Design a protein around this ligand. Structure first.
Ligand SMILES: CC(=O)N[C@@H]1[C@@H](O[C@@H]2O[C@H](CO)[C@H](O)[C@H](O)[C@H]2O[C@@H]2O[C@@H](C)[C@@H](O)[C@@H](O)[C@@H]2O)[C@H](O)[C@@H](CO)O[C@H]1O
Ligand SMILES: O=c1ccn([C@@H]2O[C@H](COP(=O)(O)OP(=O)(O)O)[C@@H](O)[C@H]2O)c(=O)[nH]1
Ligand SMILES: [Hg+2]
Ligand SMILES: [Hg+2]
Ligand SMILES: [Hg+2]
Ligand SMILES: [Hg+2]
Ligand SMILES: [Hg+2]
Ligand SMILES: [Hg+2]
Length: 264
């Protein structure tokens, strides 16, 4: 049950004025593609807050990667889902190496040592990202949906033929040259807990099959993620604003904001 939104004053949307004339803002299966300028964050924040939405953010920090946690968490505090309930889940082999980062109210962090049902009872959405990154601008509820993928910054303007999908038919991640919508990044995906667990379960099983057959997808987890999203269309697709590498790719005009970027 969703309660009514309160009175709000904002610019009237213009039916005869395209949102963006330089990029595709909706997929062929009617899933919005999130770019700056396509959403009014005040309306979205209202909608998700009225639902008391809790977002789980998962990251893995194994071995040397624990060194990226401080900047990752500190910047997440400034840009990730501010105003909403956030639960960070840090999976690491070095619990005592996790930095003590100060968190804002309504935000918590759990350290899980490595060397499920819990998510279902603790969060509404799961967002899984790479840890060797930093937030530089707003990453909010505009991304929340049952299932989302993010456009790889290196292929958003490429033809499917050039996509580095797994091309060997002997692999479960196989995608032929005449198939494919986009090339999604393995480093930033998410959705509802149920959908994210369905995706990870499908990929885990597909990778086990490949292993048994003595084959490893060209881009591992990312190759399987792409196969899954090809067959199970995401309900939202995030633009490259959400995962960029300014050192390697600069700052093109098409990107009004660089929200989440690689750390050199
Ligand atoms: C720099 C790199 O090693 N390769 C660049 C490509 O980025 C990689 O793309 C493959 C799939 O084709 C994987 O997704 C891989 O993880 C990507 O590299 C990683 O992400 C990029 C954006 C950088 O941050 C890199 O440091 C990181 O390892 C890229 O798609 C192409 C086209 O731009 O150039 C390659 O040099
Ligand atoms: O504990 C980890 C290990 C790897 N990565 C991510 O994996 C990618 C790097 O892969 P690489 O092959 O260089 O290391 P590996 O995956 O073999 O650990 C980057 O996005 C890292 O941030 C991560 O986020 N946490
Ligand atoms: Hg618009
Ligand atoms: Hg996850
Ligand atoms: Hg991840
Ligand atoms: Hg998969
Ligand atoms: Hg997997
Ligand atoms: Hg996957």
């Amino acid at each position: 049950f969703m309660v009514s939104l309160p009175r709000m004053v904002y610019p009237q949307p213009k039916v005869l004025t395209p949102c963006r004339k330089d990029v595709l803002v909706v997929t062929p299966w009617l899933a919005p593609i999130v770019w700056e300028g396509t959403f009014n964050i005040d309306i979205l924040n209202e909608q998700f807050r009225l639902q008391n939405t809790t977002i789980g953010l998962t990251v893995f920090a194994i071995k040397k990667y624990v060194a990226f946690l401080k900047l990752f968490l500190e910047t997440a505090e400034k840009h990730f889902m501010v105003g909403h309930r956030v639960h960070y889940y840090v999976f690491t082999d070095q619990p005592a190496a996790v930095p003590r980062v100060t968190l804002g109210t309504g935000r918590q962090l759990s350290v899980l040592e490595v060397r499920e049902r819990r998510f279902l009872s603790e969060v509404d959405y799961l967002v899984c990202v790479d840890v060797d990154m930093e937030f530089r601008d707003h990453v909010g509820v505009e991304i929340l949906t049952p299932l989302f993928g993010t456009l790889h910054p290196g292929f958003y303007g490429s033809s499917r033929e050039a996509f580095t999908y797994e091309r060997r038919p002997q692999s479960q991640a196989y995608i032929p040259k005449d198939e494919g919508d986009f090339y999604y990044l393995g480093g930033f995906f998410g959705g509802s807990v149920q959908e994210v667990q369905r995706l990870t379960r499908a990929c885990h099983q597909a990778m086990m099959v490949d292993q048994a057959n003595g084959i490893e997808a060209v881009w591992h987890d990312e190759s399987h993620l792409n196969k899954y999203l090809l067959r199970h269309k995401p309900t939202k697709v995030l633009s490259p604003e959400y995962l960029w590498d300014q050192q390697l790719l600069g700052w093109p005009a098409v990107l009004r904001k660089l929200r989440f970027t690689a750390v050199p």
